[PDB]
Design a protein around this ligand. Sequence first.
Ligand SMILES: Cc1cccc2c1C1(CCN(C(=O)c3ccc4[nH]ncc4c3)CC1)C(=O)N2CC(=O)NCC(F)(F)F
Length: 307
Amino acid sequence: DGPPRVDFPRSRLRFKEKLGEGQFGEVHLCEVDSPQDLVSLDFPLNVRKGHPLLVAVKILRPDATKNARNDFLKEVKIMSRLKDPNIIRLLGVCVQDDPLCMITDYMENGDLNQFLSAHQLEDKAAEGADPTISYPMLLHVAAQIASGMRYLATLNFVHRDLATRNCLVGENFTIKIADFGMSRNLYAGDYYRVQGRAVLPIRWMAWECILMGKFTTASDVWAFGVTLWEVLMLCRAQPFGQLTDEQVIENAGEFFRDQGRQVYLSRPPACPQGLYELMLRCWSRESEQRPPFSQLHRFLAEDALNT
Ligand SMILES: Cc1cccc2c1C1(CCN(C(=O)c3ccc4[nH]ncc4c3)CC1)C(=O)N2CC(=O)NCC(F)(F)F
C-alpha cells in the first residue's frame, strides 16, 4: 500500500503518442521494450505474447513549482493505495529522478463517453451502417462502475467527479474509473463557476455539494445516479440539457426547498421502470436515504437484466 521504493526503468519507456494534458503536464502513450524482462520484477504487466505492450504515463512538468511537485508525490501515494479491477491501477513510478512519472495500463478504447456515443443500441436499426452494444452489456458497463465505487467507499475515498467522461474502456467492455481533471476542451461545458467557490461539474452534483460544498460517499451515489442515466442514454445528451447552468444551480435550491418545483432527469427509453426507481433514490434529498453502492451493483448485475 505504501509507495514503491524502486523506480520503473525509465529507459524502457518508448514514446508513441500524446494522450492528454493537464496543469501537471502531459500523459503519454509509451511502448515498453522487451517487457518479458520486467514482469520478472513485477510491476505486474499484463504482457500478452505476440502483442506489443503499451502503457499510459502521467508526467510532471519539467518547469513544475515546488508545490506542484509536492502535490504530484501526494498523488503517487494516493494512487499507490488503490487496488481494484475497476479503478485505474499504478503499474510503477519514476520518482528518484526527474521527470516524475506514474505508469498505468493502456485502455484501447478511450473514455466511455466517446465510446458510447459511437455505438447504436442493438435492436434499434437507426444506424450509421457501425458498432452496436447490447442492453445486457450496457448494464455490465454500469455494474463495473458500481463495483469500483463500492471499493472506493470501503476506503472512505470520495471521488467528487464521477461521470462517463472519467471512465476508460479496455477490451471486452471492461471499465476503469479515472480522474482527468477538467482541462479537456471536449468537456469544458460540463464545468461551471459556482459563486464564492470553484469551477465544478454542477450537473452531476448533489444539492448539498452545490449549496454548501459537502462532498461525501452519499454525494458520490448521486453522481452515480447521473452517470447511470448517461450510460442508458448512450451519452447522446448532457444531464439537464434543457437547463442553463444558472438554472441548474437554481434547481439545487429547489431540491433543498423540497416543495415540488424541482425537476429530475426523466427515464431513458433503454431503462426499465424498476431500475428508474432505484435511479431516483440516488437523488433523494436526505443523504442516508440514498442507496449503498452494494445495492446499486447487485440490482445491475441481477434484477435489471430481466425487468
Ligand atoms: C496516467 C495516470 C496515472 C495516475 C493517475 C491518473 C492517470 C490518469 C491521467 C489522465 N488520463 C489520461 O489522460 C488517459 C487517456 C487515455 C487513455 N487510454 N488508456 C489510458 C489512458 C489515460 C487517465 C489516467 C488519471 O485520470 N489519473 C487519476 C486517477 O485515475 N485517479 C484514480 C481515481 F479515479 F480513482 F480517483
